[PDB]
Amino acid sequence: GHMVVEYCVVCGDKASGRHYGAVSCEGCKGFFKRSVRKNLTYSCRSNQDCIINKHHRNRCQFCRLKKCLEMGMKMESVQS
């Protein structure tokens, strides 16, 4: 038999569960909820190609939100 050990699709921290249609950590869930609810717009200081990992997840909020969307987190699942 086997355990499936899920990693956050956005940053690679261990996930806490399924949040808005993506397997994610609490930090990325909270970041996504806040970005969607508050209609936050961000800009990447570089080439919109930043690395997102658990080290400094929030160094580039633009690229972190992009990765949420590319990894299938659903803005429309955030109740408002």
Add this chain to the structure above:
Amino acid sequence: GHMVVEYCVVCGDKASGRHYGAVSCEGCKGFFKRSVRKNLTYSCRSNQDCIINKHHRNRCQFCRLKKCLEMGMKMESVQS
């Protein structure tokens, strides 16, 4: 000024346009059309709570069709 860069509401792939009342990729448009036209019924092997992302979009057809409907894709907009 800014660009709005739409993601498929069902899987998070880049959308190709508005199809049957939802911003969706070609794969999810085709899946929805076929599901509605052919009156396809599916069953989820798990707890009707599967993740839908671009990685293995069709791993759970039940959950993919549910997400199409939850995200506002309209069966009634599929011509017969």
